[PDB]
């Protein structure tokens, strides 16, 4: 019920500075931060950076329930203040993707939920651009999650916008289709299916480096997505 929101922020920052400690107190602070994010708040103009960078640090906490909750909070900041992530997109994406290799299923689940919102909230062009080097160079299963994110983002852009991004997008998918991991090859097929649904036959000249066998498999999934 307070007007002065900065005071609330200061006490939240203070509590959350207690990395690897005070788990219950920090859960309260995190939930408090979640609540604020819903509120119609003047916090963000002054404190967005400070909150975000402390929350991203908190992703590395030793306590699983803290990492998981920090990702839930991040998810809400993403869907309510997407414009503010302009200069922190690379960082925020990487941290969200990295959480996908957590040994704790609850943390991976929270990261998948965050990744989903990130893809529907962040500027689509910028997201695709950020994801391209990650898809080409990150370790399994971070590259996998990046491809899945790229797919979600591609479904949000116009044909004209996608055509402009395709030279950045295509190399990772061509290379991913040869990846040793079945899940990475499948994600790339799924991503190519989603491109096809936007640009149709225009996709074909981008695929000149594929073998016949890889073309067959892509055409099969193209045909499966068209039917049932």
């Amino acid at each position: 019920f307070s007007l002065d929101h900065s005071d609330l922020v200061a006490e939240l920052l203070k509590e959350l500075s207690n990395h690897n400690e005070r788990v219950e107190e920090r859960k309260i602070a995190l939930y408090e931060l979640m609540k604020l994010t819903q509120e119609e708040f003047s916090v963000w103009d002054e404190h967005f950076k400070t909150i975000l960078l402390l929350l991203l640090e908190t992703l590395g906490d030793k306590e699983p329930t803290i990492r998981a909750l920090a990702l839930k909070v991040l998810r809400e900041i993403l869907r309510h203040q997407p414009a503010r992530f302009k200069n922190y997109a690379e960082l925020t994406v990487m941290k969200t993707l990295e959480a996908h290799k957590d040994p704790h299923k609850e943390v991976v689940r929270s990261a998948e939920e965050a990744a989903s919102v990130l893809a529907t909230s962040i500027s689509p062009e910028q997201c695709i651009k950020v994801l391209c080097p990650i898809i080409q160079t990150a370790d399994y299963p971070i590259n996998l999650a990046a491809i899945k994110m790229q797919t979600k983002v591609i479904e949000r852009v116009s044909k004209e916008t996608l055509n402009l991004l395709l030279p950045e997008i295509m190399p990772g998918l061509i290379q991913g289709y040869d990846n040793s991991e079945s899940s990475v090859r499948k994600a790339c097929v799924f991503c190519l299916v989603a491109v096809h649904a936007v640009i149709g036959d225009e996709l074909k000249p981008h695929l000149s480096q594929l073998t016949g066998s890889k073309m067959k498999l892509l055409n099969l999934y193209i045909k499966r997505a068209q039917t049932g």
Binding site: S182, S183, K186, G212, S213, K216, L217, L220
Partner: protein
Amino acid sequence: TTALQEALKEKQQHIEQLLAERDLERAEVAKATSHVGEIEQELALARDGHDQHVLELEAKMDQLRTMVEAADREKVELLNQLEEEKRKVEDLQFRVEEESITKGD
């Protein structure tokens, strides 16, 4: 004079009857006042009966809510298992389609 004497006797009879009616009405005054307390208590007990009844119904609603909660826990569990199975199918399906092409190739 005799008619005057008889009316005097009649008026005495009326007097004796009004003495009785007066006293019998007074008997009712106490009786009605005490009836107030009896119906007050009847009300007191009724409200206690009302509150107990509400408590019994609320208990049964508690029981039902526990059943609803259990069913929601099981539903979340089954929906998780179903998502798990669907991912198994998707992964296996791709491997079989991929292996079939390599065999044809």
